[PDB]
Structure 1
Amino acid sequence: SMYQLEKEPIVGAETFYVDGAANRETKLGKAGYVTNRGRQKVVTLTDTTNQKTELQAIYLALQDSGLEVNIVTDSQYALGIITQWIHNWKKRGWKTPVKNVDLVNQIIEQLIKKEKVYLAWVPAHKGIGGNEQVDKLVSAGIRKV
């Protein structure tokens, strides 16, 4: 492949819980992260979509992290489109996606700069863990929780 994502989390490395949220009626949205070393960032966006904000959040996690990074997302699409891009690069049966192609290409360029990346999906869920904290932050003023 272009790259090999980790098969289990990287012990000792900082973990970024990413999320994004958008509203279809206004195309306003937010993307961000909270980490297990007490970092957080939330950005407000215009002209966006839910899939775009989930991807943007991963982009911020890659931009702001060290060379080894754990990333937990609740977006099956974001995980799938990134993993598929890595697995099929420069190979025969690859047609590049049309939707979000510029943003995914920006993410891949950041990804291959890292030493090790662990990227994993969890279903959205309630509680007081990491995914639930960032979900509240990106949902504020974007939709009812």
Structure 2
Amino acid sequence: MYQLEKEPIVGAETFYVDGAANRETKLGKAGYVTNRGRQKVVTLTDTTNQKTELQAIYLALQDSGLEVNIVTDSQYALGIITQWIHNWKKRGWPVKNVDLVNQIIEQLIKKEKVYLAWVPAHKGIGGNEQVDKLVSAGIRKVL
């Protein structure tokens, strides 16, 4: 893949990703739930909300087939990734989380097709609410 899909890929698994991190303990979780009934969560040490969001996208790319829809609510993650795929297109190959954004880009290009979309957090979107509950458990006191 060298460019993202403009629209959802019909017949491809859709991953709803999210991450949460505790400001005090710096413990966090990254994870996904999919429309095919799969879930995964991993716990991360010494992490940040932004890092968990990138890690969740990495997990979705690792565990998905060659065509995949990924729905994030992270403005940062979508922004920093998008900035890469556009750069690539016009300038060719970030300061924070550089190793991780690179791992993600290297995953993306090996896919056949990827649709990556943003939705607003805590607005009742079903898959998104489910994964948020998963990664926030034991991490985020209250909303």
TM-score, normalised via structure 2 length: 0.93
- Report % sequence identity: 100
C-alpha displacement of 1:128: 6.7
CA gap of 1:92–1:113, structure 2 versus 1, over 3 A, is closer
Partner secondary structure for residue 18 of structure 1? strand
Consecutive aligned runs of 4 or more in structure 1 exceeding 4 Å deviation: 90-94
C-alpha displacement of 1:25: 1.1
C-alpha displacement of 1:120: 0.4
Distance 1:42 1:82 in 2: 21
CA gap of 1:23–1:86, structure 2 versus 1, over 3 A, is same
Partner secondary structure for residue 63 of structure 1? helix
C-alpha displacement of 1:126: 4.4
Distance 2:58 2:23 in 1: 21
* Aligned length in residues: 142
Distance 1:11 1:93 in 2: 30
In structure 1, runs of 5+ residues without a counterpart are none
In structure 2, runs of 5+ residues without a counterpart are none
Partner secondary structure for residue 53 of structure 1? helix
C-alpha displacement of 1:92: 4.8
Is it true that 1:32 corresponds to 2:31 in the alignment? yes
CA gap of 1:92–1:33, structure 2 versus 1, over 3 A, is closer
Q: RMSD in angstroms over aligned alpha carbons?
A: 1.8
Distance 1:126 1:66 in 2: 28
C-alpha displacement of 1:3: 1.6
CA gap of 1:80–1:128, structure 2 versus 1, over 3 A, is closer
CA gap of 1:61–1:91, structure 2 versus 1, over 3 A, is same
TM-score, normalised via structure 1 length: 0.92
